[PDB]
Amino acid sequence: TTLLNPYFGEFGGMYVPQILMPALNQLEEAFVSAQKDPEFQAQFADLLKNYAGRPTALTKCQNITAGTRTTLYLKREDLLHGGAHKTNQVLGQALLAKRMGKSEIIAETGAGQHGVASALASALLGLKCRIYMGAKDVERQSPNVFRMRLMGAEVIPVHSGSATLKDACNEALRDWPGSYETAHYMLGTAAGPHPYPTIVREFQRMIGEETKAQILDKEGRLPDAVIACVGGGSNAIGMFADFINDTSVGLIGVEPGGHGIETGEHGAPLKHGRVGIYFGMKAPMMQTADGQIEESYSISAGLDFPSVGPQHAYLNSIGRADYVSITDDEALEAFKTLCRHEGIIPALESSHALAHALKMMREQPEKEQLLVVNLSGRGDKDIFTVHDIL
């Protein structure tokens, strides 16, 4: 029994061991209750405005587009507190954990930005936060590991399987059945078992709501297409949700194509993998031919989640959004173009979204088109990766 539907056409579900069903049902109950509670809605709004710094700007990029009939805006989740959009939905899930009377947070992290997010929200809101991070990723993400510790969180390295993000997601799912009476699992994307894909969409949907009011204000009409990178799907489904019922607006998600699709070293399971059941849900996965789960490759460490949210797989299957890919060198090019022509250093995750917009403009430079790219975070943290490559 559930109160809301766990599936998006065939994708989604609750594929977890039986002993975790009460945790999910309790969390779905609490969330439905909070979404009807105006004191909750005011509490959330106020941290997002006076703590996180919403709304965030929508910036027109006129130097980029000169000489073409593309007008491009960038929605500036890189100016949110912590540097990426992941801060909006951790403040919401922290407040839901306090609503349920919980005092502790579990979270998983790959490149470490969800760990940083979840540690800041726990510090501000008085929760004791422990974070699982695969050991290969802790070794390569020192700056992130130390920010999480500065902010009070316990960082636990995970050495099993591949010692990367899927392995810490397994370790979070091992802990929570013994601790759910007092700890909340703050899952860090729009994926995993129901009700997480719903919760995280609804706690990110203000990116798209602010984009609509800001574009109407500045251009008097909605975008031709709104473009977002897709690692597990939260910043993309947060920009798309308010525009799904506006059928003229294109929704385009961009997966990492790594070294190239045809190399097999990429991260694009929505268009290039195969549906499987893992982490709680039925959705496209990076997996071997006999069913073992594999890792996603990108130059961008944040696009490492080896599946995708099930609402993305559903909106692709009915054709209301389209999904493409962008390779490592396409992303690196767009990150350099943006620094030198607009003074904005973007995250190499976001760079994937901007690359695809730059190809939509450059292949057909006299097509009139109004594009928004979700600039999901800033790119201070990439400047030495982009240093050493070049």
Binding site: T1, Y15, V16, Q18, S162, L173, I277, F279, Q287, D290
Partner: protein, 254 residues
Amino acid sequence: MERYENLFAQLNDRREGAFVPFVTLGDPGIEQSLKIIDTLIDAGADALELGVPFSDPLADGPTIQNANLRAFAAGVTPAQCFEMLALIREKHPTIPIGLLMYANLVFNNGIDAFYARCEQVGVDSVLVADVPVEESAPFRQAALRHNIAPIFICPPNADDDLLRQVASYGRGYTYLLPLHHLIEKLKEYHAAPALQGFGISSPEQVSAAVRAGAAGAISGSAIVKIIEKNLASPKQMLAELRSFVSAMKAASRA
């Protein structure tokens, strides 16, 4: 399923519990695992619960996770596992054989296809670790079309609606994770007989499970720690697994 009905009827004629060890297929290699399993059986295991190595065992603890690591270090795949099973069965026609599977491995190439391959090699039941009763319909239905028992965990705080679905939907045995109450409810709802699992790691828990009214006990990871400990002497590993299983089974006797 038949083979568990025969087994529990035989055990009950003897007023005896069942003792069911778990191990991972291919840990620590295929030929070594074939001999550990012939050892568990010759020492008195009443049925086997066997694991197929899967990359992300999000419902297992450290002991098992390290069992899969050793099995993958030896190259073990699901295909190799089904070969293994057909040999076990050819060698031992009556012992019930269950699998402990992750969902992806069953859904992979088609869930009906999976249950037909278990029915061809002679598996009698399948517990899928990350499919709860709420998502189990295609799994149960396909197990049942191929004469395979779908097994479900009855967790420790199982509320009454969950009791009734686990009784209605499972066959073979109930994997049972106050006890005397869980157990009496399962019998009231006419559930498959209950095996106590988890922490069964010495003789006295076998005995106490039978005395609470369960049909038997499952040793979820103690057999695995004996392999892990004896990796450097295959012969000593067999001996200590014979000693341990002999005493667990001694304890189920009346």
